[PDB]
Assembly symmetry: C3
Homo-oligomer: 114 residues x 3
């Protein structure tokens, strides 16, 4: 899986250990081994949410499987929780796009997962 | 809806008011309240369009509905017009990927829209 | 087509020539003129792969068609090869997500490709 977060929160406000915590917490939520999980945080962004420049985030979670109605509700609770706790972003100023990737459409180690 | 633009145009060439203008114009174009609209602009990128470093943009628009043939034509005219007017990017050096998002695949406020 | 690479490799490690090299190599691989090929390299990113921050890359390739099982395996060997050779990223620390875009969902030149 791959999780990306883009935010107008400044880099100095991202705590030590944030990437590692996102890895572990996504491993816990998805059940996927942590070795397969990639995470990416992009602070200091020029962004707005509902016309406002208060802290917000736009995020993506891609996974081969483990995406669906109930799963996505659980990941949203988990990930909004972590953004609120660690980056002080209100959950109502977060969007997370979920992508259920076909294995044939994910490349790794010179091939794909098909 | 959420609109992202990535560009090699430098940050100092992004005029004041641009995020708010994108928000307003996208709200009107999609027929949705501006509270739903998120915008994100990423200048100073290392990018080429047709092998040229001439100003260019790579963009995304994600929406739960209001995405489709005619609608996307209209959005392209609107958004290329803005990028041309504000960032001086030629419309033929802009790509915009449109995504019609399922409500279950968009997280917000500790849950999804499903 | 568009190819984006996000990486923790520093900016000074990206060869001069790299964006042009990707443009040419992807034009050849997709069978489309280089005028249609957009490339975007984002270095110095805060990211982790498998919980470690050894050089890695998270990438996307979008195309209107020319996406599928064997074609994606081919792209993956090509792009991992370039990333290993030019940026010194191990292939088993690269993800590439592939997107087969509908023409109506790609904006360009004030309209779409439909
Ligand atoms: C120890 C290292 C080398 C390793 O074993 C790795 C592996 C092992 C590996 C190699 C090749 C294939 C592979 N698993 N592929 C798949 C393919 C499809 C899967 C699907 S599917 O598209 O619905 O069939 C569903 C699911 S599930 O999450 O719904 O069970 C999978 N786990 C799939 C899968 O793992 C797993 N992946 N990986 C990724 C990043 C980093 C390290 C590794």
């Amino acid at each position: 899986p791959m999780f990306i977060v883009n935010t107008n929160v400044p880099r100095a406000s991202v705590p030590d250990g944030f990437l590692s915590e996102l890895t572990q917490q996504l491993a816990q939520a998805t059940g996927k081994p942590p070795q397969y999980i990639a995470v990416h945080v992009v602070p200091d962004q020029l962004m707005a949410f509902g016309g406002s420049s208060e802290p917000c985030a736009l995020c993506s979670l891609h996974s081969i499987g483990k995406i669906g109605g109930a799963q996505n509700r659980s990941y949203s609770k988990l990930l909004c929780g972590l953004l609120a706790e660690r980056l002080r972003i209100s959950p109502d100023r977060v969007y997370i796009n979920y992508y259920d990737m076909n294995a044939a459409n994910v490349g790794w180690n010179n091939s794909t997962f098909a």
